[PDB]
Coordinates of C-alpha atoms in Angstrom, one line a residue:
Chain N
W1 CA 0.0 0.0 0.0
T2 CA 2.9 2.4 0.6
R3 CA 4.1 1.6 -2.9
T4 CA 0.8 3.0 -4.2
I5 CA 1.6 6.6 -3.2
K6 CA 4.4 7.9 -5.4
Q7 CA 4.9 11.5 -4.3
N8 CA 4.5 10.6 -0.6
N9 CA 1.9 13.4 -0.1
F10 CA -0.3 11.5 2.3
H11 CA 0.3 14.1 5.0
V12 CA -0.8 16.7 2.4
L13 CA -4.0 14.6 2.0
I14 CA -4.6 14.5 5.7
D15 CA -4.0 18.2 6.2
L16 CA -6.3 18.9 3.2
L17 CA -9.2 17.0 4.7
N18 CA -8.7 18.6 8.2
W19 CA -8.8 21.9 6.5
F20 CA -12.0 20.8 4.7
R21 CA -13.5 20.0 8.1
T22 CA -12.6 23.4 9.4
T23 CA -14.1 25.1 6.3
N24 CA -17.3 23.0 6.5
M25 CA -17.6 24.0 10.1
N26 CA -17.0 27.8 9.5
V27 CA -20.4 28.4 8.0
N28 CA -22.2 26.7 10.9
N29 CA -19.9 28.7 13.3
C30 CA -21.1 31.9 11.6
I31 CA -24.7 30.8 12.1
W32 CA -24.1 30.0 15.8
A33 CA -22.3 33.4 16.1
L34 CA -25.5 35.1 14.7
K35 CA -27.5 32.9 17.2
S36 CA -25.3 34.1 20.1
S37 CA -25.9 37.7 18.9
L38 CA -29.6 36.9 18.9
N39 CA -29.5 35.5 22.4
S40 CA -27.6 38.6 23.5
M41 CA -30.7 40.7 22.6
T42 CA -33.1 39.1 25.1
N43 CA -32.3 41.3 28.1
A44 CA -31.6 44.3 25.9
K45 CA -35.0 45.9 25.2
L46 CA -37.2 48.4 27.0
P47 CA -40.8 47.3 27.3
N48 CA -44.1 49.2 27.1
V49 CA -44.6 51.6 30.0
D50 CA -47.1 50.7 32.7
Chain C
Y1 CA -36.7 63.2 17.6
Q2 CA -36.8 63.4 13.8
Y3 CA -33.0 63.1 13.8
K4 CA -33.4 59.9 15.7
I5 CA -36.1 58.6 13.3
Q6 CA -33.9 59.2 10.2
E7 CA -31.0 57.7 12.1
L8 CA -33.1 54.7 12.7
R9 CA -33.9 54.4 9.0
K10 CA -30.2 54.8 8.2
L11 CA -29.4 52.1 10.8
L12 CA -32.0 49.7 9.3
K13 CA -30.6 50.2 5.8
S14 CA -27.0 49.7 7.1
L15 CA -28.1 46.5 8.8
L16 CA -29.6 45.2 5.6
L17 CA -26.4 46.1 3.7
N18 CA -24.3 44.5 6.4
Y19 CA -26.3 41.3 6.0
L20 CA -25.8 41.4 2.3
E21 CA -22.0 41.9 2.8
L22 CA -22.0 39.0 5.3
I23 CA -23.6 36.8 2.7
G24 CA -21.0 37.8 0.2
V25 CA -18.1 37.2 2.6
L26 CA -19.6 33.8 3.4
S27 CA -19.9 33.1 -0.3
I28 CA -16.3 33.8 -1.1
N29 CA -14.3 33.2 2.2
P30 CA -16.0 32.4 5.5
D31 CA -12.9 33.3 7.6
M32 CA -13.3 37.1 7.9
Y33 CA -16.9 36.7 9.1
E34 CA -16.0 37.8 12.6
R35 CA -15.8 41.5 11.9
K36 CA -19.0 41.4 9.8
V37 CA -20.8 39.6 12.7
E38 CA -19.4 42.3 15.0
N39 CA -20.7 45.0 12.8
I40 CA -24.1 43.5 12.7
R41 CA -23.9 43.1 16.5
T42 CA -23.1 46.8 17.0
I43 CA -25.6 48.0 14.4
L44 CA -28.3 46.0 16.2
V45 CA -27.4 47.3 19.7
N46 CA -27.4 50.8 18.2
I47 CA -30.9 50.2 16.8
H48 CA -32.1 48.9 20.1
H49 CA -30.6 51.7 22.1
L50 CA -32.2 54.3 19.7
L51 CA -35.5 52.6 20.4
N52 CA -34.8 52.8 24.2
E53 CA -34.0 56.5 23.8
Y54 CA -37.3 56.9 22.0
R55 CA -39.1 54.9 24.7
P56 CA -39.7 57.8 27.1
Chain P
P1 CA -23.7 59.8 -2.3
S2 CA -25.1 58.7 1.1
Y3 CA -22.8 57.0 3.6
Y4 CA -24.1 53.8 5.2
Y5 CA -22.6 52.2 8.3
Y6 CA -19.8 49.7 8.1
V7 CA -20.1 49.6 4.3
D8 CA -16.5 50.7 3.6
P9 CA -15.4 50.8 -0.1
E10 CA -11.7 50.6 0.9
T11 CA -12.3 47.4 2.9
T12 CA -11.7 44.4 0.5
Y13 CA -12.1 40.7 0.9
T14 CA -10.1 38.0 -0.8
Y15 CA -10.9 34.4 -1.6
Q16 CA -10.1 31.5 0.8
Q17 CA -6.6 30.0 0.7
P18 CA -7.0 27.4 -0.7
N19 CA -10.2 28.2 -2.7
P20 CA -12.8 25.4 -2.4
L21 CA -14.3 26.5 -5.7
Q22 CA -11.4 24.9 -7.5
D23 CA -10.6 21.2 -7.5
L24 CA -8.1 21.0 -4.7
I25 CA -7.1 17.6 -6.0
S26 CA -5.7 19.3 -9.0
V27 CA -4.4 22.2 -6.9
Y28 CA -2.2 20.0 -4.8
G29 CA -1.6 17.5 -7.6
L30 CA -3.6 14.5 -6.3
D31 CA -4.5 13.7 -9.9
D32 CA -2.4 10.6 -9.8
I33 CA -4.3 9.2 -6.8
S34 CA -7.6 10.3 -8.3
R35 CA -7.0 8.7 -11.7
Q36 CA -5.4 5.6 -10.2
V37 CA -8.3 4.7 -8.0
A38 CA -11.1 6.4 -10.0
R39 CA -14.1 4.1 -10.3
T40 CA -14.4 5.1 -14.0
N41 CA -11.7 5.9 -16.6
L42 CA -11.9 9.5 -17.7
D43 CA -13.2 8.8 -21.2
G44 CA -16.7 7.7 -20.4
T45 CA -16.2 4.0 -19.8
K46 CA -16.3 2.0 -16.6
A47 CA -13.0 0.9 -15.1
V48 CA -12.3 -2.5 -13.5
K49 CA -13.9 -3.0 -10.1
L50 CA -11.2 -3.7 -7.5
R51 CA -11.8 -6.5 -5.1
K52 CA -12.9 -6.1 -1.5
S53 CA -9.9 -8.1 -0.1
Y54 CA -6.2 -8.2 -0.7
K55 CA -6.1 -11.3 -3.0
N56 CA -4.4 -9.3 -5.7
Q57 CA -1.5 -8.3 -3.4
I58 CA -1.1 -11.7 -1.8
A59 CA -1.4 -13.7 -5.1
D60 CA 2.3 -13.1 -5.9
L61 CA 3.5 -15.6 -3.3
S62 CA 4.0 -19.4 -3.6
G63 CA 2.6 -20.7 -0.4
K64 CA -0.3 -22.4 1.4
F65 CA -2.6 -19.4 1.1
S66 CA -6.2 -20.3 0.1
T67 CA -8.2 -18.2 2.6
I68 CA -8.0 -14.7 4.0
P69 CA -6.3 -14.0 7.3
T70 CA -8.8 -11.7 9.1
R71 CA -9.9 -10.7 12.6
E72 CA -12.6 -13.3 12.9
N73 CA -10.9 -16.6 11.9
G74 CA -8.9 -16.8 15.1
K75 CA -5.5 -16.9 13.4
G76 CA -4.7 -13.2 13.7
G77 CA -4.2 -11.0 16.8
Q78 CA -4.5 -7.3 17.6
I79 CA -1.0 -6.0 17.4
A80 CA -1.9 -2.4 16.7
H81 CA -1.1 -1.0 20.1
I82 CA 2.1 -3.0 20.4
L83 CA 2.8 -1.9 16.8
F84 CA 2.2 1.7 18.0
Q85 CA 4.3 1.9 21.2
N86 CA 7.3 4.2 21.3
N87 CA 10.5 4.7 23.3
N88 CA 32.2 13.9 21.5
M89 CA 29.9 11.9 19.3
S90 CA 29.3 13.4 15.8
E91 CA 26.1 13.0 13.7
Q92 CA 27.6 9.8 12.2
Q93 CA 28.7 8.4 15.5
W94 CA 25.3 9.2 17.0
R95 CA 23.7 7.3 14.1
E96 CA 25.6 4.1 14.6
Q97 CA 24.5 3.8 18.2
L98 CA 21.1 4.7 16.9
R99 CA 21.4 1.7 14.6
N100 CA 22.9 -0.4 17.4
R101 CA 20.5 0.7 20.1
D102 CA 18.1 -2.1 19.4
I103 CA 20.5 -5.0 18.5
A104 CA 20.6 -6.0 22.3
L105 CA 17.5 -8.2 21.7
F106 CA 19.4 -10.3 19.1
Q107 CA 22.0 -12.2 21.1
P108 CA 22.0 -14.3 24.3
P109 CA 20.7 -14.2 27.0
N110 CA 17.6 -12.9 25.1
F111 CA 17.7 -15.4 22.2
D112 CA 20.1 -18.2 23.2
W113 CA 20.4 -20.5 20.1
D114 CA 21.8 -23.4 22.1
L115 CA 18.6 -23.4 24.1
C116 CA 16.6 -23.0 20.9
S117 CA 18.3 -26.1 19.5
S118 CA 17.6 -28.0 22.6
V119 CA 13.9 -27.2 22.6
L120 CA 13.7 -27.8 18.8
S121 CA 15.4 -31.2 19.2
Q122 CA 12.5 -32.5 21.4
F123 CA 10.1 -32.4 18.4
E124 CA 8.7 -35.8 17.5
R125 CA 7.1 -37.0 14.2
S126 CA 3.8 -36.0 12.6
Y127 CA 1.2 -33.4 13.3
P128 CA -2.4 -34.1 14.3
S129 CA -4.7 -32.7 11.6
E130 CA -8.5 -32.9 11.4

């Protein structure tokens, strides 16, 4: 199996797919950042006067 | 309070533009999203604080 | 023009490094892997379906091999963790005691061949086979 790889770039393969996991997680991280910004707004209003 | 009402309109338009820019940044490179989320965060707290100033 | 908040013309965004729009296989030159284990040849026809086991890489030996040594046949053992364990003079000198740092398991008292001959001389004839 080690003879199958010619350029010995299997670490490049592994780093590429870990980078792919990071990039596939960045969009959901942005969504959760917007959700945290949403949850920050719950206390920050001023209700109707009584 | 007309200055505050026009500022509220400007803040709403800026929020919509900042969302569009956030979608563009996510569509080309979702690694500088932090500053755009921060800008949406400060635009929104400015909108809410202007509403709280108008509340009395 | 009318200024709007945090819409800055001088602020510019670049693409991701690397860009996932491109084929990163072609970017880092993994084309040899992709065309060597592609399910179909890149002219529209189907390639040969490679076998589930390693018959192709054990077929080049002349031996008693007719079945597949697996986990479940009881002939193999789990050597993965033992497989995974880990431990003036110039660079050259440092490297021959690096080459000689493990030879201590090769001679007696670890592998006494007189005792090996004595235990192998006790072997009698035939083997019970079912």
